[PDB]
């Protein structure tokens, strides 16, 4: 059903552009998005934008799904054996190094915009598999597995690194409750409980605990995902089931809603044709050249260094085209930018949005054409 998810996501995003551009609505849009939301429990005060609660919740859910999927892969999929997994793993850590270094060389010594290094290293899984299904039955399953693997390794990678990078903000209290929640998840797993709702509840406790950090509130859902039992011991599996239940939500609701909230950027406000500012052009360079070159190069080096490829997908032609398709960070990149530029500046977020819009919509159209003939 990843065909309809793509079109509903693109309808949502385009509708968001229309929302944030046309004058009659583009005021309501922003006054809604930038509206202060704050909760007070006695002396406890948490305050964020509408956009920050929306983002933290939606990405919590999304990365709950990603957690489930990456576990499934790590134990029962393309990421289980050290043999099969080598090719996507190498293709990923090479598909992040090149985009980052091509954006950092393009962003030499700017302590503000340095921090957005993990922006080109994103890949909107939904939009990648969204354009990949537009080709239809001509598309092999090794390809869809490979791409859906790359997206996750890279995105979870970026989230993890950025999580380890900004720690200056988390209180000892929140860290304590976080630790005890994660502990409860662990003990609950090793004592083996089928009932998945409990894992979700404890999970929400963890989320609430680490709420003052978008990357940690996101990483919460991943922790929860990792800690839901997989084994078919029950006769049925709870993680597989929950993933199955999630997939249509996060595809028809969560992602299109996030896109509707975070992909809107004003062009009717300002569109200076000089998209050469180090964020737009550094990002575009990091995505349109960084992704395919990284993937392809590290795949040459992969093949040389004894490590073979994923069966019946032409390694020279199709793999590199997928490498281009990874150059559409669309939604995921928007989030990363909304993590690296949310606290620093309202206008760096928008030029990043523009830069990744250009870098995404182009690489999806460009990547499409080189693939419709293969």
Ligand X SMILES: CCCCCCCCCCCCO[C@H]1O[C@H](CO)[C@@H](O[C@H]2O[C@H](CO)[C@@H](O)[C@H](O)[C@H]2O)[C@H](O)[C@H]1O
Q: Which residues bind ligand X (CB under 6 A)?
A: 61, 196-197, 238, 241-242, 245, 249
Q: Is residue 197 involved in binding a second copy (CB under 8 A)?
A: yes
Closest distance between a second copy and the C-beta of residue 257, in Å? Answer: 12
Cα(243)–Cα(31) distance, integer angstroms: 35
Q: Which helix (H) or strand (E) holds 222?
A: helix 214-226
| Maximum CA extent, the chain | 63
Q: Who contacts 60 (Cβ-Cβ below 8 Å, separation ≥6)?
A: 207, 217, 218, 220, 221
Q: Is residue 83 involved in binding a second copy (CB under 8 A)?
A: no
Q: At what angle do helices 290-304 and 318-325 cross, to 10 degrees?
A: 140
Among 38, 81, 137, 168, binds a second copy (CB under 8 A): 38
Report 226-265 residues binding a second copy (CB under 8 A). Answer: 248-249
> 133 is written with which tokens?
């299904």
**Nearest residue (CB) to ligand X, 69 versus 115:** 69
Residue 241 contacts which entry, a second copy, ligand X, none (Cβ below 5-8 A, type-dependent): ligand X
**Nearest residue (CB) to ligand X, 249 versus 316:** 249
**Nearest residue (CB) to ligand X, 250 versus 284:** 250
Q: Is residue 39 involved in binding a second copy (CB under 8 A)?
A: yes
**Nearest residue (CB) to a second copy, 39 versus 164:** 39
CB count in 10 Å sphere of residue 32: 13
For 353, counting Cβ atoms within 10 Å of its Cβ (0-12 exposed, 13-18 middle, 19+ buried), the class is buried
Q: Is residue 1 involved in binding a second copy (CB under 8 A)?
A: no
Among 24, 40, 137, 236, binds a second copy (CB under 8 A): 40
**Nearest residue (CB) to ligand X, 234 versus 374:** 234
For 316, counting Cβ atoms within 10 Å of its Cβ (0-12 exposed, 13-18 middle, 19+ buried), the class is exposed
Residues found near a second copy in the complex (CB under 8 A): 35-42, 50, 195, 197, 248-249
């Amino acid at each position: 059903s990843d065909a309809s998810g793509g079109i509903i996501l693109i309808i949502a995003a385009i509708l968001a552009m229309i929302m944030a551009n046309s004058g009659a609505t583009s005021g309501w849009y922003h006054d809604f998005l930038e509206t202060p939301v704050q909760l007070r429990v006695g002396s406890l005060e948490i305050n964020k934008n509408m956009l920050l609660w929306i983002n933290d919740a939606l990405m919590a859910v999304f990365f709950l799904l990603v957690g489930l999927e990456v576990k499934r892969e790590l134990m029962q999929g393309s990421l289980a054996s050290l043999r099969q997994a080598a090719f996507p793993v190498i293709a990923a850590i090479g598909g992040m190094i090149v985009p980052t270094l091509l954006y950092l060389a393009f962003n030499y010594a700017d302590p503000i915009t340095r921090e957005g290094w993990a922006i080109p290293a994103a890949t909107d899984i939904a939009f990648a598999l969204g354009v990949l299904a537009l080709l239809g039955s001509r598309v092999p399953l090794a390809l869809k597995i490979f791409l859906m693997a790359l997206a996750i390794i890279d995105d979870l990678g970026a989230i993890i690194i950025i999580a380890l990078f900004y720690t200056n903000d988390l209180s000892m209290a929140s860290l304590g409750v976080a630790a005890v929640a994660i502990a409860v998840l662990a003990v609950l797993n090793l004592c083996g409980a089928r009932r998945t709702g409990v894992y979700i509840l404890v999970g929400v406790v963890l989320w609430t605990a680490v709420l003052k950090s978008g990357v940690h509130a996101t990483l919460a859902g991943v922790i929860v995902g990792f800690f839901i039992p997989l084994k078919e011991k029950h006769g049925r599996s709870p993680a597989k089931r929950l993933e199955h239940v999630l997939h249509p939500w996060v595809a028809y609701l969560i992602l299109p809603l996030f896109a509707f909230a975070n992909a809107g950027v004003s062009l009717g406000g300002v569109t200076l044709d000089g998209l050469t500012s180090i964020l737009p052009l550094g990002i575009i360079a990091g995505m349109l050249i960084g992704k395919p070159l990284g993937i392809s190069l590290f795949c040459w080096l992969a093949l040389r260094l004894k490590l073979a490829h994923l069966p019946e997908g032409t390694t020279y032609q199709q793999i590199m085209v997928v490498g281009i398709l990874c150059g559409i960070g669309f939604t995921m990149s928007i989030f990363i930018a909304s993590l690296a530029f949310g606290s620093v500046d309202p206008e760096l977020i928008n030029w990043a949005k523009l830069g990744i819009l250009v870098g995404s919509i182009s690489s999806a159209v460009i990547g499409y054409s080189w693939l419709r003939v293969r």
